[PDB]
């Protein structure tokens, strides 16, 4: 292609301008390029200034290539094929330019075009790059491999595909040849390329796997960081997918990776340390580690010290050698449990009590990291560590304060199982103080720590409730976005832990206004809602009637959020390319607040359901393909069925069928909530339930008889069957023979409450009506009856009837035959209570 001597002048004036000091001189020239962009012939000039025009300067030539690259990103589909084909050929001729800046620029064009433009449209690119790897000119080799690395990273899944006739079958073995090159730059590219295809179990690579391993081993000595980095990466990925082939060499690998975890370079060490985190997940960790464990624990622990750059950032960092080391230690502690303690105690002994805060801080981290795994072993030292930790809560250094909050929170359960004045109370007091610490990290650590403590403490918090509220309320005005979300968790957890004790006027007059304020500031798009509504759901359940003044605005918005979300779903479904699918977490959260509100308010919710389409929406929610949505909606169904059934009764005919299909233990929770819901429905239908029982009974029975089914599900099924039989014994009783065993085995164990009552009534009814059912397993029923400490009188009297009924009708000393295989309490419980 031929540039014009006058067009050229113009572009060089731009390039030279865009390469400038003044801010406002750049804003105008920026928008001057935005004009020229869509004119294809612009790109012809850009690539011309780069690849030709050597008389022109290097910074300007590079920028020309880099601007073109941004065009490629922005507007490449519209490039005409002759411009494109010009660029591609021009790049490839200069991929090994003598100048590093030029070379790099050309490189990134190549890789950008290869991803944006897509590989099938440059079908010679790979064999061409692969051919240039053998170039005698070093810089050409490097350049090709620079591109190849980036392409492998950007497009691995395409390469390992039918799309390009499966080129990894030559490429991978070619790459391995390059592990033995004399340039570390090229060795590194070679390994980086091959690593892109380990997790994907690329067949070319699997075939060559023992040659990959041998070749990686030969880079064990290598003393260049980027090669070490990639050998470590490789070994870590191999452990994940082909441990079978590593095993022969496992000892030598572990030796190597332990060296690299101690590496001088934090980036290499981070990649090595990942090996211990993967290895800990595998069931031969103990065997593999036996000869190195002793040294690994100190190496990990030492890696847990803050780097210097970590510290300054923290006065949102992310994943690093400290974090990785700590994660490794936490997992190892769950593997080795108390066997780890003797390795750790010598190190903790010299870190906890140390004058340099960075060292001490790391020791407190260790103490938290191993808490889960090593609890039993740790108990004897807690009486001294805990008060020590509480002292450190008021340490001068902020980062010591924050890690202290967390570590203390990791031993909450023990703290709470002791006398409350010994540890719990002082810990509370010091954590509360730190909730308003001047440092943000400490604020989040303390608020979170306190939330974890609240969960363990439950009713023990009730006496410090006014202290707790005054502090958390103030944090509402203090805390900014990140700790606010944690505050909401703390509040909601408070509410779940102290329930109705929260329902006091002064506590409400301080709490609800700031909550609502935060409600109203937020937008329905804002994910900060999730923690806020989970929070209110919890509060509402706990304030019950207290919440009335605050409910209507909240109720409506929740129902509208579900509405909104179901709408975006429909939209995305219709125009997928034009509307983004919705985040169904908004619907789940809203549905769960409405349950919390149905539960809190009972019948006081009725006036609201009466002005709502919530049942209409629930009908779509119950049919959503995401379990967690169905789960939430069946919960809400139960709740409204209890609170205000007059509004639910019209929908039962359409609901019951769907409840039918969802009695599927593929999804435990969906199934549990459906089951529960059905049961509560029955209590409201009464006899009118008769038409609907066939839809559910068989699978209720299937579930109650199914092995390895969680107990809370079994209980619910037992109770639901019970409730069906109570209102419709005729339909239910016949299958009694098939359910009475696990029904009895399940409800034996639950407390004397209203659910139990309901279910037992229903079983009593079904017995009269089909005694052939209990007879064979009638002891189970007796046992079940003896589960009751004080039955309501009328149920006691049904127990009499059935028992006398069986005692009389069988024979007044066949009873005594049968009675003598009852255990003692049972026998006597029956004798004194039922005259039997």
């Amino acid at each position: 292609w031929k540039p014009d001597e006058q067009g050229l002048q113009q572009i060089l004036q731009l390039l030279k301008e865009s390469q400038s000091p003044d801010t406002t001189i750049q804003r105008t020239v920026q928008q001057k390029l935005e004009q020229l962009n869509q004119y294809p012939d612009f790109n012809n000039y850009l690539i011309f200034v780069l690849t030709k025009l050597k008389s022109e300067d290097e910074p300007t030539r590079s920028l020309s290539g880099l601007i073109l690259k941004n065009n490629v990103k922005a507007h490449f589909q519209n490039f005409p094929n002759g411009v494109t084909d010009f660029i591609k050929s021009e790049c490839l001729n200069n991929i090994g330019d003598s100048s590093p800046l030029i070379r790099a620029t050309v490189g990134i064009l190549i890789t950008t075009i290869a991803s944006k433009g897509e590989l099938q449209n440059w079908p010679d690119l790979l064999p061409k790059l692969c051919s240039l790897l053998d170039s005698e000119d070093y810089n050409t080799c490097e350049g090709a491999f620079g591109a190849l690395q980036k392409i492998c990273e950007d497009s691995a899944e395409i390469l390992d595909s039918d799309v390009l006739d499966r080129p990894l079958n030559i490429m991978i073995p070619k790459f391995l040849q390059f592990f033995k090159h004399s340039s570390p730059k090229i060795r590194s590219h070679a390994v980086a390329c091959v690593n892109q295809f380990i997790i994907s179990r690329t067949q070319a690579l699997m075939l060559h796997i023992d040659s990959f391993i041998e070749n990686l081993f030969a880079l064990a000595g290598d003393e260049e960081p980027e090669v070490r980095k990639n050998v470590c990466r490789a070994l870590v990925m191999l452990l994940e997918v082909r441990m079978d082939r590593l095993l022969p060499h496992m000892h030598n690998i572990v030796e190597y990776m332990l060296q690299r975890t101690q590496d001088q370079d934090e980036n290499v060490a981070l990649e090595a340390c990942e090996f211990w985190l993967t290895l800990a997940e595998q069931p031969i960790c103990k065997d593999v580690l036996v000869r190195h464990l002793p040294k690994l624990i100190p190496v990990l622990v030492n890696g847990m010290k803050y780097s210097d750059i970590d510290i300054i950032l923290l006065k949102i960092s992310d994943w690093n050698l400290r974090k990785c080391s700590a994660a490794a230690l936490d997992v190892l502690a769950n593997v080795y449990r108390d066997e780890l303690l003797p390795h750790i105690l010598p190190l903790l002994k010299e870190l906890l009590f140390h004058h340099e805060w960075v060292v001490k801080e790391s020791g407190i981290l260790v103490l938290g990291a191993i808490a889960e795994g090593c609890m039993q072993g740790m108990i004897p030292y807690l009486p001294e560590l805990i008060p020590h930790l509480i002292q450190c809560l008021s340490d001068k250094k902020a980062l010591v304060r924050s890690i202290t909050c967390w570590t203390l929170s990791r031993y909450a359960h023990w703290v709470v199982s002791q006398p409350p004045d010994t540890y719990l109370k002082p810990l509370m007091t010091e954590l509360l103080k730190r909730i308003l610490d001047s440092n943000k990290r400490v604020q989040e650590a303390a608020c979170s720590a306190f939330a974890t403590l609240e969960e363990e403490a439950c009713t023990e918090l009730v006496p410090y409730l006014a202290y707790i509220l005054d502090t958390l309320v103030f944090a509402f005005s203090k805390y900014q976005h990140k700790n606010l979300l944690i505050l909401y968790d703390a509040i909601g957890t408070l509410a779940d832990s102290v329930g109705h004790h929260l329902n006091k006027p002064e506590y409400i007059q301080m709490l609800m206004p700031p909550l609502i304020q935060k409600w109203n500031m937020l937008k329905d798009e804002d994910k900060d809602l999730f923690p806020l509504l989970e929070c209110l759901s919890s509060v509402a359940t706990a304030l019950q009637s207290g919440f009335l003044p605050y409910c209507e605005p909240v109720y409506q918005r929740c129902v509208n959020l579900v509405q909104k979300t179901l709408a975006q779903a429909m939209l995305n479904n219709a125009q997928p390319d034009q509307y983004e699918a919705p985040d169904k977490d908004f619907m789940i959260v809203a549905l769960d607040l409405l349950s919390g509100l149905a539960e809190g308010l009972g019948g006081n919710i009725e006036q609201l359901v009466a002005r709502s389409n919530i049942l209409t929406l629930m009908y779509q929610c119950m049919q959503d393909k995401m379990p967690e949505v169905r789960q939430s909606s069946f919960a809400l169904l139960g709740d409204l069925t209890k609170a205000c059934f007059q509004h639910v009764k019209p929908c039962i005919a359409d609901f019951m069928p769907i409840l039918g299909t969802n009695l599927n233990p593929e999804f435990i929770s969906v199934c549990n909530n459906a089951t529960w819901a059905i049961g509560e429905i029955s209590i409201q239908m009464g006899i009118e339930m008769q038409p609907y029982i066939p839809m559910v009974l068989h699978q209720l029975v299937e579930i109650i008889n199914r092995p390895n089914t969680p107990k809370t599900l079994l209980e619910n099924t037992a109770i639901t069957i019970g409730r069906l039989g109570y209102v419709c014994p005729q339909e239910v009783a016949p299958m009694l023979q098939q359910f009475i065993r696990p029904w009895c085995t399940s409800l034996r164990n639950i407390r004397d409450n209203e659910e139990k009552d309901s279910a037992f009534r229903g079983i009593c009814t079904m017995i009269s009506v089909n005694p052939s059912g209990v007879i064979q397993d009638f002891i189970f029923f007796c046992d079940a009856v003896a589960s009751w400490i004080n039955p309501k009188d009328d149920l006691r009297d049904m127990f009499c009837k059935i028992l006398h009924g069986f005692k009389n009708q069988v024979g007044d000393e066949n009873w005594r035959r049968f009675s003598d295989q009852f255990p003692l309490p049972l026998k006597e419980r029956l004798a004194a209570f039922y005259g039997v």
Partner: peptide, 8 residues
């Protein structure tokens, strides 16, 4: 879902 705080 990132409302529980953790050093790792």
């Amino acid at each position: 879902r990132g409302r529980y705080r953790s050093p790792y």
